[PDB]
Design a protein around this ligand. Structure first.
Ligand SMILES: Nc1ncnc2c1ncn2[C@@H]1O[C@H](CSCC[C@H](N)C(=O)O)[C@@H](O)[C@H]1O
Length: 358
């Protein structure tokens, strides 16, 4: 990552490169909670094996998940499973003792920020048959009691991105910002804090909150009721934004957290982001590329997790920064500009990437 260690916005003659470590960095050491998470989803995954095998996988991708999960379960019975070196002892527990351990982990994290990342995998285990047999949707399962929003709050909690946002806003106090696939608003919430440093100071002219799904807009209008000059408009970034009613080149910063990898073709997606940006504009792209399989476990029951092979992403939709750099160059960006991980490698979750229009 040594070529992407500084940020130089070049929006005013004032511009001096700033070390990325002051602008995008981890908020804390996170190995304990990451190993708590890994431990939990490994326990659920073990507990799912017999349930999955007797279940009727009603769609091809449910079969892919069952097959994938069976192969990962074989990895638990080998030494040195990443972040779970005692995975073998978890396989060695009785079914009843494993249920006891899973419920102890839920009880431990109740009323903490870690609640969604422990409860989430439990719910996947607890509903898997109803899900693969087409009686309940995964997303509905994860929506209950606000878990999805709190889950994305957890992921965002690992990255400190407010100094970068603050620098952009102090540099351009009329910042025109658009966020792709803002969803529950986990990243929107951090970004506004960087744009609102003090009462009576708003370092942006306009925040366009977008998602492909307008179903998010009511709750996000509640969540961000305190902020002025926010719009809420649908947008599919896999398709031309101008034809969808957006103005080409009318934005200084485009924000995207863990949405771009959900699109079928990253280069076309990045070209659509570039269409929105002014000639000196920036994409700030927060994107998973952890080495472990917690995200595979959590969202593998969705058909979209199995796209990627026609887009050079056979192993799954998430790619590390070197791959983003490649595809940014193919889309008219200067490759990556700066990158900061939400943890010291190799056990990080999100790469926080800034890319400039070429
Ligand atoms: N093609 C597309 N264009 C725009 N948004 C999309 C999209 N495909 C998926 N999305 C949206 O991207 C989001 C991915 S979930 C990622 C976390 C989210 N930013 C949050 O904080 O809630 C979802 O809300 C999804 O509806």
């Amino acid at each position: 990552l040594s070529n992407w260690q500084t940020v130089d916005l070049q929006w005013t003659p004032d511009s001096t490169p700033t070390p990325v470590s002051q602008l995008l960095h981890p908020t804390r050491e996170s190995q304990s909670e990451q190993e708590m998470i890994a431990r939990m989803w490994v326990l659920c995954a073990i507990q799912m094996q017999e349930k999955l095998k007797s279940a009727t996988c009603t769609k091809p991708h449910f079969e892919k998940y069952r097959n994938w999960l069976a192969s990962e379960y074989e990895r638990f019975k080998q030494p040195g499973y990443p972040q779970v070196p005692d995975s073998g002892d978890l396989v060695a527990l009785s079914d009843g003792e494993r249920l006891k351990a899973m419920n102890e982990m839920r009880e431990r994290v109740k009323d903490t920020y870690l609640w969604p990342v422990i409860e989430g995998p439990w719910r996947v285990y607890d509903n898997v048959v109803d899900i693969v047999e087409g009686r309940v949707k995964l997303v509905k399962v994860l929506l209950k009691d606000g878990l999805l929003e709190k889950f994305y709050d957890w992921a965002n909690s690992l990255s400190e991105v407010r100094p970068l946002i603050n620098l952009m806003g102090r540099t351009n106090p009329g910042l025109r910002i658009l966020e792709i696939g803002a969803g529950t608003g986990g990243t929107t919430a951090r970004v506004f804090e960087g744009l609102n440093p003090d009462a009576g100071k708003q370092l942006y002219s306009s925040y366009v909150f977008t998602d492909i799904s307008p179903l998010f807009f009511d709750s996000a209008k509640r969540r961000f009721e305190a902020y002025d000059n926010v719009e809420y408009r649908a947008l599919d970034i896999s398709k031309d934004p101008v034809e969808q009613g957006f103005e080409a080149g009318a934005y200084d910063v485009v924000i995207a957290s863990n949405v771009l990898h959900a699109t079928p073709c990253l280069v076309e997606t990045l070209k659509n982001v570039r269409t929105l940006l002014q000639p000196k504009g920036f994409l700030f792209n927060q994107e998973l590329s952890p080495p472990g399989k917690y995200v595979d476990f959590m969202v593998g029951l969705l058909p979209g997790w199995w796209l990627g092979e026609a887009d050079g992403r056979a192993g799954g939709p998430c790619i590390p920064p070197a791959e983003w750099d490649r595809r940014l160059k193919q889309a008219g960006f200067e490759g990556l500009h700066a990158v900061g991980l939400d943890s010291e490698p190799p056990f990080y979750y999100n790469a926080n990437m800034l890319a400039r229009v070429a």
